[PDB]
Amino acid sequence: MMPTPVILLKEGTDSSQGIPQLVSNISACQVIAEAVRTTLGPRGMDKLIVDGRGKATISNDGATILKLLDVVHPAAKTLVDIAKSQDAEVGDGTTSVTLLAAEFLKQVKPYVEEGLHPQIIIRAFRTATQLAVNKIKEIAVTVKKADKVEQRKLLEKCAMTALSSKLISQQKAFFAKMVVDAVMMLDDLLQLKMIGIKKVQGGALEDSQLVAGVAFKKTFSYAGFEMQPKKYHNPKIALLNVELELKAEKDNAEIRVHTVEDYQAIVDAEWNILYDKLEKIHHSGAKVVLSKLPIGDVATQYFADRDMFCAGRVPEEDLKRTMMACGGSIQTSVNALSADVLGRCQVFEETQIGGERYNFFTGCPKAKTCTFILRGGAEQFMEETERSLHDAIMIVRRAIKNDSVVAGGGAIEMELSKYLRDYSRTIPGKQQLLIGAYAKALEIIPRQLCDNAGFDATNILNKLRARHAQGGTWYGVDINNEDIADNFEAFVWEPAMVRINALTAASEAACLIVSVDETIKNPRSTVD
Amino acid sequence: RPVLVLSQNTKRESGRKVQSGNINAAKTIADIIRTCLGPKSMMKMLLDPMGGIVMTNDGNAILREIQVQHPAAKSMIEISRTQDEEVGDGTTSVIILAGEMLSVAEHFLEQQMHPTVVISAYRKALDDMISTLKKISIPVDISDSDMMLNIINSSITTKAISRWSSLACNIALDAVKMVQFEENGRKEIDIKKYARVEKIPGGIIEDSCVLRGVMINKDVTHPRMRRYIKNPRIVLLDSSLEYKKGESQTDIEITREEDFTRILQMEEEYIQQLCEDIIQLKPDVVITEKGISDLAQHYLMRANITAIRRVRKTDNNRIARACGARIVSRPEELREDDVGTGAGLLEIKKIGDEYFTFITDCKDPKACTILLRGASKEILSEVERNLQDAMQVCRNVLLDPQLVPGGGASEMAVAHALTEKSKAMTGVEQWPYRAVAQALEVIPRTLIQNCGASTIRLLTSLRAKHTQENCETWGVNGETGTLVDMKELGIWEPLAVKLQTYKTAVETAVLLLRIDDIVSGHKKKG
Amino acid sequence: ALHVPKAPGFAQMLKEGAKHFSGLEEAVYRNIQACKELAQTTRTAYGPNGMNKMVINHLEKLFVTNDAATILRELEVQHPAAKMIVMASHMQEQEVGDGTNFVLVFAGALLELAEELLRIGLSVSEVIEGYEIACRKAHEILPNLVCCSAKNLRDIDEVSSLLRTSIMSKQYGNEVFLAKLIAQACVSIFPDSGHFNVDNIRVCKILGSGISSSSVLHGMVFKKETEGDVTSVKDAKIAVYSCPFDGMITETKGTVLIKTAEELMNFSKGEENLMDAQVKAIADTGANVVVTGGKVADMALHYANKYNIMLVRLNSKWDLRRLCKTVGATALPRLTPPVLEEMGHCDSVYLSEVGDTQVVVFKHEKEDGAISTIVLRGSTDNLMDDIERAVDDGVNTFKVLTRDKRLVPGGGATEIELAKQITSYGETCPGLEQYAIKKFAEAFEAIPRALAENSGVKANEVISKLYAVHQEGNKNVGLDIEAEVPAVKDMLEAGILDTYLGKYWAIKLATNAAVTVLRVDQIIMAKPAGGPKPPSGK
């Protein structure tokens, strides 16, 4: 190089180009994939990440682990992005996507080092991915009967498969039944905001319950609250968005009087306004009053004197769930509290759960919402239980959308690898090597499963390859018996969309990484 | 903690960047001295780190007085030094040619051509250039002094000494002719050792001359000596003429009263014996590279002998060559053949405020000194450099009596011949061949640029002229910017210088084209 | 005798951090070298076989693309000459929308050959004059190189074929699908009136399902949720309000002056009754969807829920105007019920979830409307951004085709023919201008050379074959990238074509930038300042 008295780019700009740059990109992708390798399979392990604030997060979820890592390598961030994409679109497979992408890049690295043109590799990946997706759609097993029992069993099996890698895998049948029950009560959109997740410290995992209704924590009761009865047997619920307090009529309001009689009249008028609101609420027949805005002590004592229940400052989403379950309407005005806008539940009760008070609305027959109350011995315990249940919920929702399943345990990918190898053996030969590399790369997941289980990956892979070649589509890794088994008959079921999205995203990430040849890093501005 | 498979201070570069940097560094080196070529060259002032000033237009001196960091520039500096040492002329030409060849090679390197192909084409072109240069050469009768003087004048027309051309040419020719020596069937010139150049600031440059003998900045040891001897018999020595300690430890032990005086008297007697052994040959001048004792001076003046002491070994060797003497390290072994007869005059005269010893009338001397008088030390240094160039050119012509046309005529003729040969190549390496062939046009182009005329019109006219049959001696007139027949202007230059220039330029291009990786920062590990 | 003082005059008068460069070697060659460096940095992304580049700006924002204009935007270019060439490229992007890499490559080649000409002995003025003459000759030749015309723009297949070439340079693997999408979106737009608006094509990027799952929608998509409880309307009668969905207030100052208890008790009840009357009046016109640009009052939302009116809030007024154009409504400044002319109609409005984000869709069933939207799926944000850049290039190509319908062969065929014709013209012109004209013609070789280099073949063999075929008389023959060896093929049948205006404007701007760079003789750079950006750029 030369000093170049006036330089072209700003001083401090770093540029890397050529084969070394792409090889380094592949190595960075390998490094990222290594961080989630041991989290895959029933024998997977959890990771603990501590941030600068000292708060530790414990997760088996690949997307969460990748997000927590402060990745700054531009090529490595693609793996995190595709993990986020897989979590958003599907909700499961956030580790398989990264493993597949890194394995693709690793398999094609030797060809890159030989000077092979990246466009050829990109075309080979596109062809292989299209063929693999078509094969998945072709061989996916579906039942065209719409049988309720069969559909529920399929959903439960999919939830169990999605759950048999987390800390709650011991109670996976229990939690899968809970998740299927929760999802089946959503109406048509399967909105996630309609499934509440409450975490209460203390108690065992089996103590966790699903409320066929709505439940939320007690919200800063005022004085006189303890005189209110805490159990009703057919209450009418008045959902309100109203501040039941003595307060200024308006922010800009001002009262100008010149007589003590008018002063007393104004005071009595404020009191009468509050009491008129309370009386309009009371005459509606409602026994439980929930408000999004604060309810004052005067209103609390007024309701206590009438054997009523009040709870102010209820969170908005909890009020929405209460409306969806009991079947009323949130009223910003109490002037027309007809029976149409009043909720109704069979039993309302306030009980204690692990040192916290919760309000229970059970017995709703037309409920379109749920509430999970999760019990655990630690904060991160409950958080990871929530993450596992979220994975199961996404899986069950996707299965509701389309009941197409493929066998897990790597069986689907071994079948895809065999199909792609057979296809590659019938092409000129420049694309043959790359498609064969793709097929070999698809074998990472069963190998990773065997490695995590402490198995002999080579022997299991050889047996799987021979079995698939000689006949058998759903033969995968059997973790319990340290052998191979028909995973379809073992009910290791995954929705086809999970693997479809995984292959698509991994191929797109690999093609994007390979397509780059130069990286330019401008100097940081305002480093401070 | 930091692993560092390699050391932290190690930095590595590779790829197209290295080649571009090397070629640009060579181009910059060439651009430094591009303007110092031709009869219309402009001088430059160099400030030494020691506080001195060098004012010159010689390419090698300018490049030597520059410190660079890019190793390609170091290669170019070494190339200039090699050209100066091998032939003494053509340093600016070889630097410019190397730069131009590297530029035209970068042209192809920007495309998808491997440097090995360019190197092979360059080597084929170098062979063809050598063949054509040998073809267009003409012979020279070395016995003709007029032709030799004309060749030297063509050599020094571009230097600051050109204003006094006949004087400098005669000085160089006479020095080279009289230093020429032959013994035991081996011929030698040896301008480095003999033909010493001594510069005394002051006087006028017209008073500069080559002496038929030697000059040293020495005076007689004693004022009673003779400062003017007509036909001296000179004796040269290495050993001191004084009492000295022995090699072995030789402690004495004195117990008698008369032993001390005896020791001192025997020291005196040893000095007397050495002086008598010297006197036995009846010489007139005694020269020693080491000290001469005061008692020895007395004993020599007793015999009317002029003595000079503390002379450098190189100076004493030059004196021996000049006066036909032989250095003797033991006076008791002094033979008649060792006494130097042949010097026709010895004179100690004072120039300015210093005494100088002249042995300047030798008959058939094989060594000489060049007395330079000038305005100052920088002017005299430049004059000495120009005289060195002239003597190197004269020696090259004497060794190789071939000549080639100057003024860029040889460049254009060889370029045309190579271009004509290139149309039959019908390959992929013909393009670098033709490009490096036409890269020779940078010498006439630089000459025209320095003259100040129009480069494109004159160069096109010269190419059209060289496309004819008998036009290999058509070059550029450096003073008027006109096309002339080079055999009419008569600026010819030795074939050896041109061959060395072409070879060195092509070899530099090959060497620098071959490198694509640079690693630096590692320790010497010595 | 140990230091060289500054020369008396301007050198001593110069400021501390200032720099002064004068003369050929010190200014012009340095500028040419800087421009050549910039062109070389951008060169590798040219053509279909161009490679994407990860560019990280000063804000740690990652750009991966092969769009030359974007790369130059995100690069901290410091040299003034390179800045000038970047300005020319950005002007080409603004005027046409494609051809920025061509501008940069042509300017770099022109400046390199200008340095070569100056070295052989030509003057700057002679080079500039020859370049201008050759540019005029090229602009004269160019209309004769037109091979085919668009000849239709309301078709789908034909316009898709036209736009395939423009978005084949970027996203070389899958350009047919993107061409079909952009063609459908542009054909929905561009009514019987010849005016075509680029802004009417909206791109909404939703993450998750790969770019092959992208679709075109006749309407608008907004990534947010509804304020009310109604989430789907089948015969939308949207009424758009540019005012907050709340009781209008005085602009001067509000103060409720209460003097009696009756007023204090009746104020809130009267306000509620008034707002209920307003909402009922709005609903009586049949408006089942209400869109507002401001906040929504709680009582307003309650009374809208009571009357089953879907509420959508648009914070950005540009989105409000675009929605008004899409539906055919007028933004009411007040909360008055809309008359039949101001009430927009959309055949379906609903709340939906695509991937993860919640979206509100104003969907038309006809294949028409003022605004059309392309929803882009994908697995990465950067990939979706690159697809959006390709969509912008396709839309700009469609706009250029609407302006001028003439097309020229691509893949270096037009460049090679132009070089041949300009060389033939310069072979006849006497004087020193012939060297500059021939160098200008040779500068066109940088396009097929770059295409061949990116494709991975030998450029010299491709160029020699191109000259051979063009001398034979085939003006529509160019580089064939679907081969492992240097080969050429006729590119009228291949359908690889370029817009005439794109080439015309690119040539004009590149030549102008080159001659403007050459005109500079002295540079006086002031001391750099660390100011918080010039106030003009904010």
Ligand SMILES: Nc1ncnc2c1ncn2[C@@H]1O[C@H](COP(=O)(O)OP(=O)(O)O)[C@@H](O)[C@H]1O
């Ligand atoms: N009972 C099982 N036996 C064998 N393999 C299983 C079983 N359950 C799940 N797997 C495998 O675990 C993999 C998914 O691991 P997991 O960490 O749960 O989700 P992710 O795909 O996000 O990593 C799937 O490829 C599946 O084949």
Ligand SMILES: Nc1ncnc2c1ncn2[C@@H]1O[C@H](COP(=O)(O)OP(=O)(O)O)[C@@H](O)[C@H]1O
């Ligand atoms: N009177 C002249 N007219 C034209 N050219 C000349 C004349 N004298 C010398 N030259 C040319 O100038 C060159 C010598 O330049 P010089 O400064 O000696 O360079 P270098 O020091 O590298 O030899 C020779 O090639 C010769 O052809």
Ligand SMILES: Nc1ncnc2c1ncn2[C@@H]1O[C@H](COP(=O)(O)OP(=O)(O)O)[C@@H](O)[C@H]1O
């Ligand atoms: N299929 C193809 N075969 C050969 N050349 C092509 C093909 N498609 C496009 N090109 C060429 O690529 C060039 C476009 O390069 P591009 O990357 O778009 O730069 P810019 O964006 O500055 O136009 C066009 O000149 C065209 O001739």
Ligand SMILES: [Mg+2]
């Ligand atoms: Mg899973």
Ligand SMILES: [Mg+2]
């Ligand atoms: Mg010379």
Ligand SMILES: [Mg+2]
């Ligand atoms: Mg383009």
